[PDB]
Design a protein around this nucleic acid. Structure first.
Ligand SMILES: [Mg+2]
Ligand SMILES: [Mg+2]
Ligand SMILES: [Mg+2]
Ligand SMILES: [Mg+2]
Ligand SMILES: [Mg+2]
Ligand SMILES: [Mg+2]
Ligand SMILES: [Mg+2]
Lengths: 146, 53, 118
RNA sequence: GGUAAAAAUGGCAA
RNA sequence: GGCGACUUUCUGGUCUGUAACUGACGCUGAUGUGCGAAAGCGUGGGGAUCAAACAGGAUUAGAUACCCUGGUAGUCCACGCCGUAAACGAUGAGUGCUAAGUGUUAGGGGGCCCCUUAGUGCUGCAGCUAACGCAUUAAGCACUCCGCCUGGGGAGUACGACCGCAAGGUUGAAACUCAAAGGAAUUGACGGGGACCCGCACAAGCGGUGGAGCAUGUGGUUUAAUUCGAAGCAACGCGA
RNA sequence: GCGGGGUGGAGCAGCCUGGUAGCUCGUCGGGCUCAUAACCCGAAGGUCGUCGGUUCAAAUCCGGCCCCCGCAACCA
RNA sequence: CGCGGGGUGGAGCAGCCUGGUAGCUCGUCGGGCUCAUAACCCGAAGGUCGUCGGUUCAAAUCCGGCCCCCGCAACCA
């Protein structure tokens, strides 16, 4: 019952790091339209990651997202392994990063987000586990790929 | 029996195999005799399928 | 413990329920076999083309360990996994010299079972 | 070729 | 009713042409008398497959089913019996007459074409029909003979008779009861029918409700009275 | 005459071997449905037949009593 | 009383033999999916191997002791 696809909205590059992805991360962190708190958390997290890592914050963030983003996923139709679209890949990566960061035990969000981004760069975070689990279930359903 | 030709792909040979099976109609026959169809029903199917043909 | 058969026959029995691949010498003595069920495929997955491929690959690999290099393929049954099995033999490194269909057909013989009303 | 499986019932009037 | 590998033996019918012969010798057919799918029955033989019953497994609220694994009679042969099927073209047999077009089976005749005989299909006038439809393979137009019908239920029951080893078959009521049973077609509605399309319908997401305290409406209960109205969606922070 | 049993509303465990009340259904509140059933979720409910005894403690062990069930009731 | 065998997540079942390397399968738990249910798929837990010693680079593993269990002989106070 649908006419067709709808054009997606676009985001300006992050001022501090000049990445569109950074802007999208702020949007996922933001709650109730409170942009400033979201930006504050992200920028502080990027400082902490660089401080602990000793490497550029964007580099580790990019390394982190690369590990979290999933090539294949199961879709109910029998679950069939399907290739995640490039845009979908980013959505899942950012969503998983923020959600699993929120479930971490550190007192402040900034520390949780930094620990998550660091862990994902080492391929050891809960978000990484989510990708691995997604890939496993996709491989189990490889027979239904057709 | 399809025999792989010299300098011919196994996949290419597989294409030849599939076509030979289709002409033989061994698949067609197998499906028909999976379950028993009462004599009158068999005769009806023969007629109407021929009507299609 | 180690045979040396260069030329053999690969028999693929593909059904709607399962795929079984047995590799034999030309005299019908078996060298290796694999099935969708043997590889741990269950239910619908047993009849999938992927399961047929994996069965073929496993059986081929074991047979090659007995020194099989060339194979003649005989196919029986109407299941979806026949072609995948044939490609798997080639992929395993065995060369398919010939492919033949051996599915049994009666010349109006024994009464088939009842049709499934459901 | 298919196929998902299960899937009961409901006063007579006007 | 039926009849599908091939071979041989015995045997029935039909069609074409010809026009030797016979010379109306024909048609129908009550009562009779035979044949008659499948299941079933008797005696003997056989038994692969399939498969009532039956037994597990499963499904389910239950599942004495559907589905799965088995499985006996039976399915097969011979000889008897049974005598029934939506035994249907739901269309008795015979005869003649009445537009065409096209396919096919077995012939005949004359120049691939035309003509013709007997079948077998499709399409289609006239005519017919409640309509659907039928239409030289009539359900048209006619004549002969036979069988059969006269609202639905009770009831193909009861009783009697006959037939059958049995199962049952054939024949076949009434009391009583109802105002209807029915055929075809039409418009809707509906469908665990189809096609094609939409809608925050789903999917993909985000934030909630259901859990706590409280506010408020409602039900219920209570009360002297707890005013009256709203009740699935489309009553319930609704009239207010 | 001699055994067995009496446990939420029903049926059935726990007793042998004292400390522990289970299971299935039902009931009740909520949900699903237009509604009902089915199904889903949460919850309540048995002084263990009855009086006694023993024991720190009794469904449990022991003795009466009542109820129920089975078996026996023979030789003349 | 002699002889033979065994003791390993809750349980069963290997590696023991042929020392280094406790697996396997159900029972669990949490998830996914199933309208659903089950099944299936994914993750996680539970035995330090009967026990105690010796030997050994290293022993559940081998050698010993000890205990428990099972089977078979012993079965003419
Ligand atoms: Mg009604
Ligand atoms: Mg018969
Ligand atoms: Mg059956
Ligand atoms: Mg009759
Ligand atoms: Mg004609
Ligand atoms: Mg609330
Ligand atoms: Mg209900």
């Amino acid at each position: 019952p649908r006419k067709g696809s709808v054009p997606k909205r676009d985001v300006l590059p992050d001022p501090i790091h000049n990445s569109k992805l950074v802007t999208k991360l702020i949007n996922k962190i933001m709650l109730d339209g409170k942009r400033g708190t979201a930006q504050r958390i992200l920028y502080s997290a990027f400082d902490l990651v660089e401080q602990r890592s000793g490497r550029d914050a964007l580099e580790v963030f990019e390394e982190a997202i690369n590990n979290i983003m999933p090539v294949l996923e199961v879709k109910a139709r029998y679950q069939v392994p399907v290739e995640v679209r490039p845009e979908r890949r980013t959505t899942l990566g950012l969503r998983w990063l923020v959600n699993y960061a929120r479930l971490r035990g550190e007192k402040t969000m900034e520390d949780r987000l930094a620990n998550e981004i660091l862990d994902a760069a080492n391929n050891t975070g809960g978000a990484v586990k989510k990708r691995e689990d997604t890939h496993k279930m996709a491989e189990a359903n490889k027979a239904f790929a057709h | 029996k399809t025999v792989v030709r010299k300098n011919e792909s196994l996949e290419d040979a597989l294409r030849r195999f599939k076509r030979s099976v289709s002409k033989s109609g061994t698949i067609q026959e197998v499906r028909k005799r999976e379950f028993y169809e009462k004599p009158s029903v068999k005769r009806k199917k023969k007629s109407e399928a021929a009507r299609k043909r | 413990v180690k045979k040396n058969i260069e030329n053999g026959v690969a028999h693929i029995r593909s059904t709607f329920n399962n795929t079984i691949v047995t590799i034999t010498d030309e005299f019908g003595n078996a060298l290796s076999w694999s099935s969708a069920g043997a590889l741990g495929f269950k239910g619908s997955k047993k009849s999938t083309p992927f399961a047929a491929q994996m069965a073929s690959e496993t059986a081929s690999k074991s047979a090659m360990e007995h020194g099989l290099k060339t194979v003649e393929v005989t196919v029986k049954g109407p299941g979806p996994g026949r072609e995948s099995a044939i490609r798997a033999l080639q992929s395993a490194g065995l060369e398919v010299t010939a492919i033949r269909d051996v599915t049994p057909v009666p010349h109006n013989g024994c009464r088939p079972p009842k049709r499934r009303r459901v």
